[PDB]
Design brief:
With 257 residues, the chain is mainly beta. It has a single domain (1-257), classed as Carbonic Anhydrase II. It has helices spanning 13-16, 127-130, 154-159, 216-222, and strands at residues 29-30, 36-37, 44-47, 53-58, 63-67, 75-78, 85-94, 105-106, 113-121, 137-146, 169-171, 187-192, 203-208, 212-214, 253-254. Strands 2, 3, 4, 5, 6, 7, 9, 10, 11, 12, 13, 14 and 15 form a 13-stranded mixed sheet that branches. A two-stranded parallel sheet has the order 1-8. It is globular, with a radius of gyration of 17 Å. The structure holds histamine, mercury (II) ion (HG) and zinc ion. Histamine (HSM) binds at residues 59, 64, 91. Its main location: cytoplasm. One of its GO terms (molecular function) is zinc ion binding.
């Protein structure tokens, strides 16, 4: 079944999901000297004030925090986007050591983790229909560096104990995603895909330039999660990241100079 190990890892995904070798795959390396300023890009608009978090779940490849997306409560607009995209879920990718763990890299630099806020374009009515369109989704990606503790992430850290293994879920309401945003909203944008199967090339990537800092202690609780289900041998959930894919015909744009 796909995973991140040696026999079912990213190097093998292509056998079940042939699009893994397509033309707009993701994570990519963001070469900062080849990324071009685009003055025509608008500032991003993040309206997360009415967000309703509902649950936190260990799906066997990451942990997801899920939001109510049946009304326009947590939405992203502006930037490189046409229309409103509603927040559906956020999740992270991390490493087994602090020097690796992000999916996207900047000038070949890897960060300790990467947070992904997943949104679907509300012209398509539901997430299922948005993943059938070249513009169905917008993913906001944020780098995590090990430094000082991020107070807003602690509520997530303290709950991991209870979703340790695959299939477990916990109620997780009143979580505000605004506590996970850096101070600056400057970004790089390019057309790509989801970085886990089915690798659908449906995504407009919005990668924030400024990383947020997390404590070593916080990143360490992530590394305690398990890939396996309860009652199976213990495999810690670490290195759940896909390596950078060739950029091919894509131009990375910067919202800043
Ligand atoms: N296996 C599809 C579930 C999913 C969506 N996002 C993260 N995980
Ligand atoms: Hg698509
Ligand atoms: Zn992701």
């Amino acid at each position: 079944h796909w995973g991140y190990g040696k026999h079912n890892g990213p190097e093998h995904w292509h056998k079940d999901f042939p699009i893994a070798k397509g033309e707009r795959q993701s994570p990519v390396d963001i070469d900062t000297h080849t990324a071009k300023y685009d003055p025509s890009l608008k500032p991003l608009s993040v309206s997360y004030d009415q967000a309703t978090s509902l649950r936190i779940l260990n799906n066997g490849h990451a942990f997801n925090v899920e939001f109510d997306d049946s009304q326009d409560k947590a939405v992203l607009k502006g930037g490189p986007l046409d229309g409103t995209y509603r927040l559906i879920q956020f999740h992270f990718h991390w490493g087994s050591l602090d020097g690796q763990g992000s999916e996207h890299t900047v000038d070949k630099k890897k960060y300790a983790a990467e947070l992904h806020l997943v949104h679907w374009n509300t012209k398509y009515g539901d997430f299922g229909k948005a993943v059938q369109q070249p513009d169905g989704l917008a993913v906001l990606g944020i780098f995590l560096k090990v430094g000082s503790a991020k107070p807003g992430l602690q509520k997530v850290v303290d709950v991991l104990d209870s979703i340790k293994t695959k299939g477990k879920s916990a109620d997780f309401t009143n979580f505000d995603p605004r506590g996970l945003l850096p101070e600056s909203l400057d970004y790089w944008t390019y057309p790509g895909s989801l970085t886990t199967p089915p690798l659908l090339e449906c995504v407009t990537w919005i990668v924030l330039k400024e990383p947020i800092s997390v404590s070593s202690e916080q990143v360490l609780k992530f590394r305690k999660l398990n890939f396996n289900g309860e009652g199976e041998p213990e495999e810690l959930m670490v290195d759940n990241w896909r390596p950078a894919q060739p950029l091919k015909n894509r131009q990375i744009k910067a919202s800043f100079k």
